Amino acid sequence: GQIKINFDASVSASMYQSKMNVLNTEQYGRAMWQAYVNDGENPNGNALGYAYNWGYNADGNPVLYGMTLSKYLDSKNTMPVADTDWFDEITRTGVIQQYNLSVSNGSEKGSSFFSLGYYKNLGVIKDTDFDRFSARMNSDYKLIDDILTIGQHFTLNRTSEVQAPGGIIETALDIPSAIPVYASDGSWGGPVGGWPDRRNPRAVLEYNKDNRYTYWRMFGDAYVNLTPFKGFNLRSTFGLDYANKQARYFTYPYQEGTQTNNGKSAVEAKQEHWTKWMWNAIATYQLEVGKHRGDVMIGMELNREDDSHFSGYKEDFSILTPDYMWPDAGSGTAQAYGAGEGYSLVSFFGKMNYSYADRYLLSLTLRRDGSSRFGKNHRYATFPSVSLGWRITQENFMKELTWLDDLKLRASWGQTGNQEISNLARYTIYAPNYGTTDSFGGQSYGTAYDITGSNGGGVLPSGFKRNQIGNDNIKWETTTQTNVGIDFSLFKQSLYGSLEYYYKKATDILTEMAGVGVLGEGGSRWINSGAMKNQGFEFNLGYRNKTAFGLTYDLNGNISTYRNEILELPETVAANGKFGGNGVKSVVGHTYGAQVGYIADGIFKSQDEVDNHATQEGAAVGRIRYRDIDHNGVIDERDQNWIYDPTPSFSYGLNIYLEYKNFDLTMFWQGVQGVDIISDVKKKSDFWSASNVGFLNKGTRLLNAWSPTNPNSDIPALTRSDTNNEQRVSTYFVENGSFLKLRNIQLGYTVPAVISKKMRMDRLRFYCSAQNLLTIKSKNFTGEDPENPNFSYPIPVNITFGLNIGF
Amino acid sequence: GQIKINFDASVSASMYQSKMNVLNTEQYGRAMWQAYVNDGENPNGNALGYAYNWGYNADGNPVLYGMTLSKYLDSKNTMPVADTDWFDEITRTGVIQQYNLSVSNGSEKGSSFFSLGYYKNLGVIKDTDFDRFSARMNSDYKLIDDILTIGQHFTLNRTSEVQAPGGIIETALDIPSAIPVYASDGSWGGPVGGWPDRRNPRAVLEYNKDNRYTYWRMFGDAYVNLTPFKGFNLRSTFGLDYANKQARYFTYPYQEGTQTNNGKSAVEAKQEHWTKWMWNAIATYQLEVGKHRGDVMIGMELNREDDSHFSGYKEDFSILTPDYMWPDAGSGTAQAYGAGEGYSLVSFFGKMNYSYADRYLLSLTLRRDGSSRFGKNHRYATFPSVSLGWRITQENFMKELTWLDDLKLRASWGQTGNQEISNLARYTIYAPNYGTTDSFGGQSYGTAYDITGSNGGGVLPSGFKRNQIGNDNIKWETTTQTNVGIDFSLFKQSLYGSLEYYYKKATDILTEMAGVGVLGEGGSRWINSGAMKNQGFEFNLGYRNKTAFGLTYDLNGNISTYRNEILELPETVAANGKFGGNGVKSVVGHTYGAQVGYIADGIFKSQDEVDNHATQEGAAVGRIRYRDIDHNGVIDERDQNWIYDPTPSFSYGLNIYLEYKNFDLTMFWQGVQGVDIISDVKKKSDFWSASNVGFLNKGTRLLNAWSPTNPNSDIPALTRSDTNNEQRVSTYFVENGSFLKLRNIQLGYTVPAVISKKMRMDRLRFYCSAQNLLTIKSKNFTGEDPENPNFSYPIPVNITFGLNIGF
Numbered sequence A, B: 001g002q003i004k005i006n007f008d009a010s011v012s013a014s015m016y017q018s019k020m021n022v023l024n025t026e027q028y029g030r031a032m033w034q035a036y037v038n039d040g041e042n043p044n045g046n047a048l049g050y051a052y053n054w055g056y057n058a059d060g061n062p063v064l065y066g067m068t069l070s071k072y073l074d075s076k077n078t079m080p081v082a083d084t085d086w087f088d089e090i091t092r093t094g095v096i097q098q099y100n101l102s103v104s105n106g107s108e109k110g111s112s113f114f115s116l117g118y119y120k121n122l123g124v125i126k127d128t129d130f131d132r133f134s135a136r137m138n139s140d141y142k143l144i145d146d147i148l149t150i151g152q153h154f155t156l157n158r159t160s161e162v163q164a165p166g167g168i169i170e171t172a173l174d175i176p177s178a179i180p181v182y183a184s185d186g187s188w189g190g191p192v193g194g195w196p197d198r199r200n201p202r203a204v205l206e207y208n209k210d211n212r213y214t215y216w217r218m219f220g221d222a223y224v225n226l227t228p229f230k231g232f233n234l235r236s237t238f239g240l241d242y243a244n245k246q247a248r249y250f251t252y253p254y255q256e257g258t259q260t261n262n263g264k265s266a267v268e269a270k271q272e273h274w275t276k277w278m279w280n281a282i283a284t285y286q287l288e289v290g291k292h293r294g295d296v297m298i299g300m301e302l303n304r305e306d307d308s309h310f311s312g313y314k315e316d317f318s319i320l321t322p323d324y325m326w327p328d329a330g331s332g333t334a335q336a337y338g339a340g341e342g343y344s345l346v347s348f349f350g351k352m353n354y355s356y357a358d359r360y361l362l363s364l365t366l367r368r369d370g371s372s373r374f375g376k377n378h379r380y381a382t383f384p385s386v387s388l389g390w391r392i393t394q395e396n397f398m399k400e401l402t403w404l405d406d407l408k409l410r411a412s413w414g415q416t417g418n419q420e421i422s423n424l425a426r427y428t429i430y431a432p433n434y435g436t437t438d439s440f441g442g443q444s445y446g447t448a449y450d451i452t453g454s455n456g457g458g459v460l461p462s463g464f465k466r467n468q469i470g471n472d473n474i475k476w477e478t479t480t481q482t483n484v485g486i487d488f489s490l491f492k493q494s495l496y497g498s499l500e501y502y503y504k505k506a507t508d509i510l511t512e513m514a515g516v517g518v519l520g521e522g523g524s525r526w527i528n529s530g531a532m533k534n535q536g537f538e539f540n541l542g543y544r545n546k547t548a549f550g551l552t553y554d555l556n557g558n559i560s561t562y563r564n565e566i567l568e569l570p571e572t573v574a575a576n577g578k579f580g581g582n583g584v585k586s587v588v589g590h591t592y593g594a595q596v597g598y599i600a601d602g603i604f605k606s607q608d609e610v611d612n613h614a615t616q617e618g619a620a621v622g623r624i625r626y627r628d629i630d631h632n633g634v635i636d637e638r639d640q641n642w643i644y645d646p647t648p649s650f651s652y653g654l655n656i657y658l659e660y661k662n663f664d665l666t667m668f669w670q671g672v673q674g675v676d677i678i679s680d681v682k683k684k685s686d687f688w689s690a691s692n693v694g695f696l697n698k699g700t701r702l703l704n705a706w707s708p709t710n711p712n713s714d715i716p717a718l719t720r721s722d723t724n725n726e727q728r729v730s731t732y733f734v735e736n737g738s739f740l741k742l743r744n745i746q747l748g749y750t751v752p753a754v755i756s757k758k759m760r761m762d763r764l765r766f767y768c769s770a771q772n773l774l775t776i777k778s779k780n781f782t783g784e785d786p787e788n789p790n791f792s793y794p795i796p797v798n799i800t801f802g803l804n805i806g807f
């Protein structure tokens, strides 16, 4: 009948634009010397030396005059000295290209659709990539001209990626720049001696580059819709969603500096399989009697997911290439892994819809849902909802205004469930875990022991081990929610918007609860722990017009606000600070995620302020001074109060569309103001010893720590050990996370239809676009991303060129 | 738009209706007894007991008077004696159901298609099933009216089977009927003591019943067709065909009489992937200048297949249920398995077509194919073809004969490549087989030894084992086929048919040739071994008509005939047998498969026959007597001649269609005439001792084998040892397999269009059918399936009810 064709294509370059700055290899020594002399041991007896000619100023203080490092890091000259930018070393400009062609055909009789597309992505991490092919094929048929439709949706995907390893950027930022990339032969460089037991990340990436998965996913449905007469039709649909991931991971042997493997080669070939199917059947009747309108609907839907996975492991390979490293060619020992899980949900439902004329509307809904995840004392759970509005501008007493285009007054109340918890929540789980599986520094937890004292060479006797305690009285998390709002439109639909207010109250919150310590192994269980309150207001306001000199504009902002309150909690649960006041104060009556901690009042600027302040264990000159809230003249542990609050003062957003002379400009600003933010990145940027591993690289800012020669710095001095417990929960780690993000900007040129039609087109538009271009942040923030405080690096900046084609 | 709906359904009961009859537990004793007295030893010393009270018949010939066994076959009363119809026990009435719905809308802008089929098979072996779901969803789209159409094809399968284990039936037939299905406590029956080392089939079917694979395959293409002006269109098309098998195989402990697993539990988690993709481009121009008509096409096509598989095996499970037995839950030791293979083909090709207005016709074709399978020196081969035809009834001198409607004279000469060999056929392959895989009676060939003498307890040294020697000059198998034929039609399209003659010449036949013994391990290689020849005539003759009384009838006749001969082999190959000749005579000049053996002129009825005969190492009274082809007085290894040739004298086939008064009866007959077939079932049916396993259970026609109390019988006497070498290659095992078979027969009733239209149908038909319902034997044949001589059972007889609906 009518055939539509749409083509789209993009390229997008993608760049990290900022990161936590870390020590130069030059400054890494300045930082150490300063730490050593602050603590009064000879700076020249360091394990990494780094030889200094320092001394004192006529003032008694120490002064650094100069540094020398001896070309190689060892007395054998295997590892030359470098000044590596480990971030720039494992980082690329990312590049994205994608195209998509889609074509639809709608006769009346039926209508089909077809779609191909491709996306490819050079990661911003080196030796990483990702690609995806999609095909979509949808269609329907009218078997009996207004009585039997039959139809199908289908989508087919194939993905292939080499993923970046578990936090490598994090591991690039704390590998001192003194380490080189390459050793002196040309090997992969790496630590030597007492430098930190961190492996070369550029090398990690290479050793990873052949670990690629391949993922296929089929998902769609078929449906019949039968209309037995007038305004009543029934219809079932059936759907599946099958996915499949296969990959091989390679262990290759490495011996870079002190990082050895000693000579381990292995292969793991793993398989994963997810199979979800679903089936509903739905009948609807609707009427229409002059000033009377009604919908009623009734139906049910089954779901069922069964997923499952397994794996084959073999060590020792005579050729170190992915062509040879298949389990068949392995010589050494082997392991086999795999399990599976699943659940099924069943749901029955109905909806009521009624309207008088077009002024007063009413709607009721009722569902009963049941979940595999529960007993059967609590399998099912019924949820009701009622909502009703009043189109006021249809009241005839209103009418006279006439500029007031529309005005409703909505009010809803309903309940909804949550059973999104582990598939084996209710069970006491005992695993036979024999210990066939990697760990770190021990913690097999393996239940297999050489009882005979033979030292092994054989199969040991195995056991069972508890993974979880059950909860055979575990029930749904019901959430009760109550909305009321006012929709408005004005001046010939040029000023549109809304104002609503919500109150959400959740009951029998589902969480997984770490068990008390003396309970021992697998003390965690899934429990319901009480209630939480959430409520606030929303505002939407759009203004779309078009000035005399031909400039279409459409603005549409949003502003929000909400207060959160933890209501009840089991004493144990309030005691152990999970919701959660750090175990020093309960949270009931405060906010989900509120934290109690010590409060840091700058630092001690001479020996007098230390005596003129409570007996503080490790209080010295230059250390952090924590106020006393005892007001008993000692610090101890009762000292603290509430110091962190996650809830923002309000969050806002504003979307800008413009069109002028075929040019086409759009923006989207989001932001939040007045928000507390707590983070650990300072522990790596303000201290030389606020970590558990020695001599890792540190942030750039502790270069400006307090010292004799440099005071009135907020930042404590530099020591070789955390004697003052600086890494206790304090306000040192709470900063201001107010910001204003420019999510997206996109400028477009659309070629005039008068001549885009000359080439058998219709729409022909080019555009340029950026994502996360810029953020506007508080002065009080140490750095990086305010809405991801925990990360030492920001999000990557995209910049895109692209076109659309119309036909 | 024109919408067509199609529904087809079928149910279908499957039944065995014959099998080789084996011994009653009553007879088994009679057969053992006869062999015992025959060789002259006390039949009461049987290891299976079985006590007889026999004697002599007033002629000096032994007579059986009676048998008895005990309640139990053992001095422990665990295995009671039975008369187990073992075939009947593992055999079922199979059952099939399938439906198929399909729907197709055809608009002039484009057409689409949708199909949903389901098929389920209860196998005729117990504890085996099979089911398949399919969704097809094709379509196309006219983007520019008859200039630029775009299209797709998609198909999606999901099979799930449990496959009967290899040779279950062939195990059910050599298990003695005395062994009970159940032991006397209700566990599983099995052998005990001297009875043969062979497990209860019914129990093997149980232990197999959860070894279930879940296969998913999806294949299709997308294409574009660009037709610029008229007669010239470019087409490229891309297609893929991806599939996935996964199963778990469960090994559970068993102890059944003298049949122990030693309490083994294991689980293998297999996984296979098969991925093919195909791309081509095809240009086609075609011309039509009045009398003349042309078609030239040109284009290329690349194919690539990569497949792979891997496997995780684990032992020892505290719960013997498929729900417990995942690799994770295992406790004993683990193996990991897997590898991959792949190939690619490139193909270029052109085509010519031409004629003067359906009178004289010419077509040339040329293609040049390439295969990764070969070395670079013979990657590509070129293949010409030319054919030409002459519709001679279009001639202006033949209008006289008016009965004659049509007559064409076709004639072809072509070449065609064969390339289907092992992916790695060109290579010398060295596997690093360590020995991580199952075997029977050893013969791991594991290349892993305990060089230190420690008896193991850890990971042993390993090596490499040659798997095959490579060619570095292997090449294509060409086939030069040439045909000539006559297509005719007489008496107003009522007496139709063809007669053609063909000549096929293969050159450099591609086979896998095993090495000679003294080369030992590896040895095997793929080579080209000379040429073979095939020529024949084919003939078809139909007769369609409709009598005066409303009976249409259509009789398709068909009668093949052909001869086969090898022309040229390498010296070492003609000698080693392989293609015939058994190592005793070269085949060069005889039919592929021709065999050479001793020739068996019946059996000796008295010592006069033994003595006036020729010297025959182990001749006796009752034995087979082999003739003295040599004419030298002795019977040795020079004594055989050609005794087997598999070309029939002529094959034939016949179809019968009969319409009458809305009924629709059809039949299909196939048949071969005048063939030798050679088998091996006679070793199981005619001899007590011609196997390598003890006792076993044997055919029923060793129950009229020769004895003094029963002479004039073709079947040798029973002995306890094959001292005469009866199982030498003899004509005792060649029979006549000339058969005739009713493939299919089907009665249908089509509800008259004029009433199937009043209710929306169009075609409405029911039918009942039968597959392999009967077979004509030619009584000189000992039994079962003459066109499957090597089997002990036939194909099952299918009976099927079904409907067809078209709207």
Ligand SMILES: [Mg+2]
Binding pocket: B628, B629, B630, B631, B632, B633, B634, B635, B636, B638, B639
């Ligand atoms: Mg002889």
